[PDB]
Amino acid sequence: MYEFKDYYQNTVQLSFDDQPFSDSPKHVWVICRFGGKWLLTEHEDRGYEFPGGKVEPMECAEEAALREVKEETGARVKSLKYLGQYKVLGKEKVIVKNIYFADIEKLEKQADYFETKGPVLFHELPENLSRNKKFSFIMKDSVLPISLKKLKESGWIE
Ligand SMILES: [Mg+2]
Ligand SMILES: [Mg+2]
């Protein structure tokens, strides 16, 4: 497993094995690709980030991933695949977040994008994310570059 510190200096433990940290993760993160572009969402408080959020009680992590993509980008998922899992060792709470990769079929218009501004398309990620004020802190640590490198090696992208 990979171990590093996030943007707010909290310890993060990253793994690509099947749910090693928790049997039932309460958070999900979805890396979205629409054609040859990256599908992101603009959080009203955080900024540009890949879709994700909290898992509902009656809902499972896979169903929560599809729901969060639809809510934050208005996108229809063609295929959803589990990539890995990460644990965030916070100051007051420890969270377990599942990473999913989603190939996007289409973007449908919605009346409301909930707690986000809606879908944002990127041909390629800017340089460098860590010091970009328009981006969310969740995109600023090592979770994103390591996950993207694992997507290339698996043959899921390009
Ligand atoms: Mg969310
Ligand atoms: Mg949401």
Side-chain angles (χ1 to χ4, degrees), residues 3-27:
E3 197 178 64
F4 48 87
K5 283 184 180 285
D6 65 17
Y7 193 76
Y8 295 113
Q9 299 300 102
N10 297 297
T11 313
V12 180
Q13 291 184 342
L14 175 70
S15 178
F16 295 94
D17 300 302
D18 182 60
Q19 297 188 330
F21 310 109
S22 186
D23 176 40
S24 62
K26 300 281 113 72
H27 295 83

Side-chain angles (χ1 to χ4, degrees), residues 71-88:
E71 285 180 11
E72 302 183 349
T73 58
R76 283 269 222 92
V77 177
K78 191 179 88 181
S79 65
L80 196 98
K81 295 167 182 181
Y82 173 85
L83 181 68
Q85 197 178 71
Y86 72 98
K87 194 193 275 178
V88 181

Side-chain angles (χ1 to χ4, degrees), residues 32-40 50 120-127 135 148 157-158:
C32 304
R33 189 89 163 157
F34 174 64
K37 292 172 183 283
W38 295 109
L39 177 79
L40 276 88
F50 275 110
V120 190
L121 293 160
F122 275 91
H123 190 90
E124 59 184 317
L125 281 319
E127 65 300 287
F135 275 81
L148 295 175
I157 56 158
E158 298 294 296

Side-chain angles (χ1 to χ4, degrees), residues 96-110:
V96 177
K97 205 147 172 182
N98 253 34
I99 312 153
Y100 290 97
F101 171 69
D103 215 276
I104 309 296
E105 191 212 315
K106 62 181 182 180
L107 262 77
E108 288 184 303
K109 92 121 181 171
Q110 295 194 122

